[PDB]
Amino acid sequence: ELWYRQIQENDQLKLENKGLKTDLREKEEELQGLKDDVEKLTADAELQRLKNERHEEAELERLKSERHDHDKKEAERKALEDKLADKQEHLNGALRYINEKEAERKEKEAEQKKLKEEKQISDASRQGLRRDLDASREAKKQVEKDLANLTAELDKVKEEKQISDASRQGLRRDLDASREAKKQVEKGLANLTAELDKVKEEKQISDASRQGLRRDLDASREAKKQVEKALEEANSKLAALEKLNKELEESKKLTEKEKAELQAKLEAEAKALKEQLAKQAEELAKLRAEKASDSQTPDAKPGNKAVPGKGQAPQAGTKPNQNKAPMKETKRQLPSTG
Numbered sequence: 001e002l003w004y005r006q007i008q009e010n011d012q013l014k015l016e017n018k019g020l021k022t023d024l025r026e027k028e029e030e031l032q033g034l035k036d037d038v039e040k041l042t043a044d045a046e047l048q049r050l051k052n053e054r055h056e057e058a059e060l061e062r063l064k065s066e067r068h069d070h071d072k073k074e075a076e077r078k079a080l081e082d083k084l085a086d087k088q089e090h091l092n093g094a095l096r097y098i099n100e101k102e103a104e105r106k107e108k109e110a111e112q113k114k115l116k117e118e119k120q121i122s123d124a125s126r127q128g129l130r131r132d133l134d135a136s137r138e139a140k141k142q143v144e145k146d147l148a149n150l151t152a153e154l155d156k157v158k159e160e161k162q163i164s165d166a167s168r169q170g171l172r173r174d175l176d177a178s179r180e181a182k183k184q185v186e187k188g189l190a191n192l193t194a195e196l197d198k199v200k201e202e203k204q205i206s207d208a209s210r211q212g213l214r215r216d217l218d219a220s221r222e223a224k225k226q227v228e229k230a231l232e233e234a235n236s237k238l239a240a241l242e243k244l245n246k247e248l249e250e251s252k253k254l255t256e257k258e259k260a261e262l263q264a265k266l267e268a269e270a271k272a273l274k275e276q277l278a279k280q281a282e283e284l285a286k287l288r289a290e291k292a293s294d295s296q297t298p299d300a301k302p303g304n305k306a307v308p309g310k311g312q313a314p315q316a317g318t319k320p321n322q323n324k325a326p327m328k329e330t331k332r333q334l335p336s337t338g
Contacts, residue, residue: 020064024074024083030063036079040086043079046094048144103128103175103182120193124182131181131212132174139167139219142227148289152229163227167219174216180204181212231287235280238273278303 017031025041028034036059037044038051043060058079062069070077103125108116118125142150142164150160176183187193188205195201238244248266250256257263279300285291301309307317312324315331316338331338 020066022063022066022073024066025063026084026086030061030065032059032061035059036061036063040084042083043075043081045081045083045085049081101171103132104179120186120189123189124179124186124193127182127185128175128179131185131209132178132216133171135217135220136167136170136174139170139221139223140164142224146224146228149229149231149287150227152231152287159227163223165223166226167223170216170219170223174212174219178212178216180208181210181216184208185212229287231284231289233280234284234286235276237277237280238270241269244269275300275304 015033017033019029019031021029023029028039028041030036030041035051035056036042037049037056038059040046041060042063043058044050049058058075058081060075060079062072062074062078066073075081075083105125106116106118106121108114108118142160147160150163151157183193184195184201184204185208187195188202188208244266247262275297279296281303282295282299285293285295299309301307301317305317305319307320308314309317312322312327313320314327315323315333320331328335
């Protein structure tokens with residue numbers, strides 16, 4: 001924890017760093033205000049690993065400290081991915097975009113280099129940025145928890161893009177019909193924005209406003225959840241079949257027990273509901289989001305037979321069958337109870 005060449009160099013004034021450009025970055029290199037994985041230099045790949053993640057520690061400071069921090073030349077360590085990862089002969093992706101995110105502000109020309117008077121046509125724009133827009137993207141943001149279950153076991157009948165959709169159109173209906181809550185939160189302010197006639201386009205100061213807080217600010221009520229199906233620990237087990245327990249719950253309320261052939265399901269399927277259970281008490285993998293089974297028997301012995309069942313099974317199990325691998329000496333040899 002030394003410090004040699006001890007001239008008083010530490011904090012200083014006015015800041016704009018540079019590259020030390022051993023490029024593995026494309027652009028926005030090691031500059032730690034716009035940091036080493038804050039965008040698309042070495043090891044901040046798109047598809048959600050920018051400063052969006054819960055750190056900048058994939059903030060790959062190796063771009064300048066390429067051989068001075070960890071000589072992997074950059075990533076595959078502190079930033080758990082490969083560089084920008086961008087450029088090689090697959091020119092087919094990522095759709096760089098521009099959009100009509102236009103809050104229907106005034107229609108303008110440039111015979112003065114366009115210095116028009118946007119006054120409440122622009123107060124409407126800035127109120128749209130509040131109502132037209134806020135609560136319109138959390139209605140769009142079905143992207144980091146619900147992204148798993150927009151379509152559940154259905155034969156990939158695309159619906160994930162049709163319920164969050166009503167919010168990605170929520171900057172058009174918002175921008176012109178919650179821009180009711182602007183084109184009238186903006187003239188109900190004053191008649192300088194042409195407000196329609198009669199004595200009841202005057203309640204609309206707040207009613208076209210409520211159209212906003214019903215179309216844009218409740219866009220967070222309509223769309224976001226409207227595609228909801230569950231990929232929790234994907235087993236409630238005995239409870240989805242609790243109709244077995246009809247013939248065993250009928251044996252305690254009142255006296256019964258006619259033919260006993262039908263009691264070969266109550267405590268018979270429950271027999272397979274310790275392998276099924278010990279799968280439940282373990283994990284998911286019923287619903288899509290990539291699924292099927294690695295644990296419904298390839299690892300169901302734990303609890304069932306009580307031994308690991310992969311990679312040269314240990315000597316436990318009540319029927320062990322191998323003694324060839326690295327391990328912890330297990331049964332004839334002994335750790336604590338086997």
